[PDB]
């Protein structure tokens, strides 16, 4: 059904701001995952700097993209048939760990074969949008 993962990652002008309020580019990591449990349970430190081998076992493919303030990145990546979930996590300076707004996860049934899912980056948050 879905051969290709299509994402459109778009940044507002003010994203990932420093303490002085200056917008900064951000790395966004895209993960093709066999399962979601390890990814969803990982905290920011664990996901980005940790040695979780269960998480490593779940990751089929990963891409790191660099999103400029006011910019956009198109992801058009072969979707592995074993990728039941796609995780998208931003390496924000200031992630809101309490609200868990620094990452999103999509099941296969949330993707479209020939249309991208739009992910908005605004401040220190990611939001899936129509």
Numbering used by the authors: 22 to 151
What did the study's authors say about this model?
Among the six secretion systems identified in Gram negative bacteria, the recently identified Type VI secretion system (T6SS) is composed of 13 core components which form a trans-envelope apparatus. We report here the crystal structure of the TssJ protein of the enteroaggregative Escherichia coli Sci1 T6SS which likely constitute a prototype for all TssJ-like proteins. We reported here the crystal structure of the TssJ lipoprotein, a critical core-component of Type VI secretion systems, and its interaction with TssM. TssJ is a β-sandwich resembling transthyretin with two additional elements: a protruding loop and a small helical domain.
The polypeptide chain could be traced from residue Ile23 to Pro151. The segment 1-22 anchoring the protein to the membrane via Cys1 and its phospholipid thioester as well as the last four residues were not ordered in the crystal. A unique TssJ molecule is contained in the asymmetric unit, and the PISA server did not identify any sufficient interactions between TssJ molecules related by crystallographic symmetry. TssJ has the topology of a β-sandwich formed by two four-stranded β-sheets. The other face of β-sheet 2 one is covered in part by three short helices (h1-3) occurring between β-strands 2 and 3. Noteworthy, TssJ helical domain (residues 57-71) is absent in transthyretin, 5-hydroxy-isourate hydrolase and ExsB, but a single helix is located on the same face, between strands 4 and 5 of transthyretin. The extended loop (residues 38-45) between stands 1 and 2, forming a protruding extension, is also absent in the three proteins. A group of aromatic residues, Tyr65, Phe113 and Trp123 form also a structurally important hydrophobic cluster stabilizing the α-helical domain against the β-sandwich core. Coupled to the observation that TssJ-ΔL1-2 was correctly folded, we concluded that the L1-2 loop of TssJ is a critical determinant for the TssJ-TssM interaction. Collectively, the data from the in vivo and in vitro experiments demonstrate the existence of a 1∶1 stoichiometry complex between the C-terminal periplasmic domain of TssM and the TssJ lipoprotein, with a Kd of 2-4 µM.
